[PDB]
Write a protein that binds this ligand. Structure first.
Ligand SMILES: CC(=O)N[C@@H](CC(C)C)C(=O)N[C@@H](Cc1ccccc1)C(=O)O
Ligand SMILES: CC(=O)N[C@@H](CC(C)C)C(=O)N[C@@H](Cc1ccccc1)C(=O)O
Ligand SMILES: [Ca+2]
Ligand SMILES: [Ca+2]
Ligand SMILES: [Ca+2]
Ligand SMILES: [Ca+2]
Ligand SMILES: [Ca+2]
Ligand SMILES: [Ca+2]
Ligand SMILES: [Ca+2]
Ligand SMILES: [Ca+2]
Ligand SMILES: [Ca+2]
Ligand SMILES: [Ca+2]
Ligand SMILES: [Ca+2]
Ligand SMILES: [Ca+2]
Ligand SMILES: [Cl-]
Lengths: 353, 359
């Protein structure tokens, strides 16, 4: 196995694919160097065209070390690689490295599988879908499926849903292709890696137990998560006909200040809603108190309601909105929150006692 | 106690005075047209003064530092912040944002023991910053030898010098400050060094240093820092510097740093040994590890001495090169069983000593 490639053609591939699970599989075959990384749950494969003389073969080398060596070399460096016995030699200028290897034959593969559902979409649309909902995924819930993210196709829409039982996020985007009605749950790490590959359209293939994403010369494949993901349609309030609208940054900063004097564990704040006014209060066991009064647009009935302020702040930070709409039902029911100018994402938060 | 002040006039003071429950509070005092803010951990203290141009009323209290800081930071830029005592609480009001914080009595706020100034000098802030930045990284962290967990400040003739060592590597920096000084040295605790450094912006306000038998004080503009000294004996840096090294190599700092950084990848993770082979205008760096992986770097340098080899800890050498931020570096060599002294090729102000390794 031999190849010579420009540093700059290796960096992003090495970054994307980065005992044998600590190694990268390198394969020179036909006109291409393939680099694969895996943790047994997911894998990333990068293809790099070899325009300089090369010789076929395969090995595995330590991922971090190989990446650090390449990125540590100067801009414009040419990197010559060749397998010598059981070592992999890396040479560039008068820099030389000899890395340990493990046999390519030992590198693990995911089980073979068939594509059942397929669609293409812009990278920007996938970024939007993930960033809109990722923060609402559970962390270490015994309901393992809540620790990942639902990807649902319905009509011509792709939708993401994330929830931890206390708050929920849902985002739907049109992708202009007739889709089957189908849903899958992508594990947390898979969502992270899928986001990290978005710098070229994205081609997605979904099987019974796997999802695959093709972007440029990268292919990401992940196992899916088993389980019954809750239906967001049963979580959206049926008729939250009290509508308050407010500036997103103004509201966020008021909540952020009140939060300072909220209970450190339970983070409770109280909202008092009245004609074109919102009052936010907070208190803690030290009997310290915060109060914020804000002008809003509200012409519904007066009510009060309590929330974990972190969940509300999380939503406002995700929206990056100009104005926000809060849609209320009563003091003991969830609230729905949206960008005042877009229905494409919605957020549901439980009240506190 | 009452005052009203613009948000931004509190932020820098609050940053500076922030780091037993009352140690988590700041002392606030309104007196003779000035708000004073004090933070302390019993070892050191920072006092910040803010001039009061708006109406105020005298008095003193203490308030949770982080909460008060976070409230002030969280208010909008330019906000007017009105503060008054109300019973056992401190009220903070700005626009339609209102807060009521707990207080502890000013009478319970602890003071450092009284002391007398014995040695004093004034220098530019930039000079003190240069002296501390050049050596700070070489202080010990939580060594059993408590006197190394800090920095030596030495006056001699007309110069001020800092020394820092962890028993393995050493940094020293000396700067002339244009004042006749007594020959004196003290050890400032590492947390105090860090706090002192954070107080200096390198601006046009002069820095005044006062040293007593057991304390040091630094005054710049509206800020006064006081710390206890470490009551111990510090090592003599003159005995650590390799005596009259006979060999001198000079290289580009970034090129040398990048060569060591790449070689370090395949060095022992615990002991970090790399080997140098020096020959006419050439350096070769090698590294290997227990898995028998190997790195080699060859680069052009300026060297006309005898051929020799030496090993050292590459983490310590990288620390030096990162601290120097130099165009060119000089390595002063003797042999494979002696320490190395490293300096900026164009300044003798700072020097660094790293021990040899047999690899
Ligand atoms: C505690 C609760 O009632 N939570 C509701 C969702 C929030 C308003 C986001 C809810 O409808 N919970 C149901 C369904 C469910 C289950 C898991 C995750 C989200 C929603 C329930 O707890 O069974
Ligand atoms: C281990 C060793 O010999 N250390 C020397 C200093 C390094 C080269 C920085 C050394 O000279 N050690 C002496 C003096 C000393 C003591 C504490 C801290 C620094 C220097 C010794 O160990 O007694
Ligand atoms: Ca190439
Ligand atoms: Ca070699
Ligand atoms: Ca079909
Ligand atoms: Ca209040
Ligand atoms: Ca939607
Ligand atoms: Ca302090
Ligand atoms: Ca404002
Ligand atoms: Ca005093
Ligand atoms: Ca003096
Ligand atoms: Ca001198
Ligand atoms: Ca020497
Ligand atoms: Ca000897
Ligand atoms: Cl109190």
């Amino acid at each position: 196995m031999k190849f010579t490639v420009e540093r700059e053609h290796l960096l992003k591939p090495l970054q994307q694919v980065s005992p044998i699970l600590g190694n990268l599989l390198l394969q020179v075959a036909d006109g291409t160097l393939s680099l694969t990384g895996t943790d047994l749950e997911m894998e990333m494969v990068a293809r790099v065209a070899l325009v300089q003389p090369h010789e076929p073969g395969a090995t595995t080398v330590p991922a971090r070390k190989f990446f650090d060596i390449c990125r540590g070399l100067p801009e414009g460096a040419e990197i010559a690689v060749q397998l010598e016995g059981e070592r992999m030699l890396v040479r560039s200028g008068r820099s030389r490295f000899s890395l340990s290897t493990l046999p390519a034959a030992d590198f693990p593969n995911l089980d073979d599988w068939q594509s059942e559902v397929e669609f293409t979409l812009p990278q920007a649309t996938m970024k939007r879908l993930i960033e809109a909902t990722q923060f609402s995924m559970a962390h270490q819930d015994v309901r393992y499926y809540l620790n990942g993210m639902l990807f649902e196709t319905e009509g011509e829409e792709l939708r993401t849903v994330a929830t931890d039982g206390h708050r929920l996020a849902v985002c739907s985007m049109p992708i202009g292709q007739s889709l089957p009605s189908h849903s899958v749950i992508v594990p947390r790490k898979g969502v992270i890696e899928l986001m990290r590959m978005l710098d070229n359209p994205l081609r997605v293939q979904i099987g019974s137990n796997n999802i695959r994403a093709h972007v440029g010369d990268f292919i990401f494949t992940s196992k899916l998560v088993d389980g019954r993901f809750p239906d967001y349609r049963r979580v959206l309030p049926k008729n939250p006909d009290k509508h308050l609208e407010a500036g997103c940054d103004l509201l966020k900063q008021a909540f952020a200040r009140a939060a300072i004097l909220s209970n450190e564990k339970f983070r409770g704040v109280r909202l008092y809603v009245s004609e074109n006014q919102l009052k936010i209060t907070a208190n803690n066991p030290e009997q310290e108190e915060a109060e914020e009064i804000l002008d809003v647009t509200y012409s519904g009935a007066e009510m009060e309601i309590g929330f974990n302020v972190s969940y509300v702040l999380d939503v406002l930070n995700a929206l990056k909105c100009e104005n926000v709409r809060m849609m209320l039902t009563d003091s003991v029911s969830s609230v729905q929150i949206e960008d005042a100018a877009s229905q494409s994402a919605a957020y549901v938060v439980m009240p506190m006692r």
